[PDB]
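Students often ask what a holo structure prediction actually looks like on paper. The answer is less mysterious than it sounds. You provide the chain, you provide the ligand, and the output is a string of discrete structure tokens encoding the 3D arrangement of the protein together with calcium ion.
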Amino acid sequence: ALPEPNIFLIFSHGLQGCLEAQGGQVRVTPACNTSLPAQRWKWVSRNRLFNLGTMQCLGTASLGMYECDREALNLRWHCRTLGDQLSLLLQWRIYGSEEDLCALPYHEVYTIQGNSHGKPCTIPFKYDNQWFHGCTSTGREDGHLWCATTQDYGKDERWGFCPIKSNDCETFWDKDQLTDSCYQFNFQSTLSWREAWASCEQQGADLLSITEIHEQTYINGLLTGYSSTLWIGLNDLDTSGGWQWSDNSPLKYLNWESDQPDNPSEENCGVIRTESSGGWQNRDCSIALPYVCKKKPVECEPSWQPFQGHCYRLQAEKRSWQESKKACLRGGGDLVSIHSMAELEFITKQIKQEVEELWIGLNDLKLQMNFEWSDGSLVSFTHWHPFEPNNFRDSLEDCVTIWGPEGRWNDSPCNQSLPSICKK
Ligand SMILES: *[C@@H]1O[C@H](CO)[C@@H](O)[C@H](O)[C@H]1NC(C)=O
Ligand SMILES: *[C@@H]1O[C@H](CO)[C@@H](O)[C@H](O)[C@H]1NC(C)=O
Ligand SMILES: [Ca+2]
Ligand SMILES: [Ca+2]
Ligand code: NA
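The corresponding structure tokens follow.
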């Protein structure tokens, strides 16, 4: 009915055949078949190997198919040693890709809504005395996919919906009518930031990025009436002090609360707080919070140099950001708007060269911590120095400079007198 990305056949190059469960027992069949449930295996939780025809787990001496409740016996297998053990008790690879047996490990799958607070599915689990190796629509009404979060639903009755990878928003998302972006606020869940990351990824989505004041106010609008602190995609992890959105959105808009971010050492992940009234803080990525997901289904004059259908030049005369912009206008251009990493590397290495810092034209003059290119071009990417943009020591820093070897960006008071770069 559904897909099965993690099921594989277990194939011996010692013999020529792949493992199956026929009868009650397990043998090697040269008749390898991807379609036959007896031959196809899935790693499940607690180091167990589940066979789809038997709906049972490999066990041990000898080898057998046994119900997976029956933890007793062994049923515990480790993928590095699995081949050596088959050789001794009956070389081995996954069939057809010939890769090692650790290539399709068991991953946890976090549950949407239900009573389990987002807790991961327990695979396999018993419901109505049947065993299941994944999500089913059985026992439900509506048809939706759910699993148990306990290994016997009859006893504990702890369950939740399955993350779906969909190109639509049906039933689990709020849609902003104006932007057609979809959002999921999981308030019951308590997950670490990395588990939340994994959960939005499992739905074909990604953790919340707030790229603009509209998006922020829509978020506030959906949070009216709650008290809560949720994970967002904003995080410090990938390199320390430089903030990034989980999805690769440019950091174009900043809602940090007053005197955030703090604790640069172990507080690496952002949260949105109804308390702050939608303000942002950073926190320790290991605490368990609710969390938010989203998805949206003629070369030039002398002294200018070409890059990618545009022209660039250095203006060496030290001037305020505003006067620099005027000198660019007097030519055929505006201050340089930067939409590529390749473009930043050309600018920094070929043009900036030894000059330490110059104006680039990215500015929050119109609305604080909402950054714009002077030429009206969309801000599609940023590269900031760590802890920038800060409006430093609580002063207005309304204009952006490139600084230092790497070409990372700083916000600065605009009356500062520096060089600049233009493009047309
Ligand atoms: C697998 O076995 C079934 C038995 O019904 C057979 O019909 C099918 O053609 C086999 N698949 C392949 C790929 O040979
Ligand atoms: C920028 O303007 C402010 C306000 O008038 C002034 O206090 C400051 O000294 C100026 N800085 C420079 C570098 O001109
Ligand atoms: Ca500013
Ligand atoms: Ca600054
Ligand atoms: Na904090």
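The pocket of calcium ion (ligand 3) is lined by residues 364, 368, 391, 396-398, 411 (CB under 6 Å).
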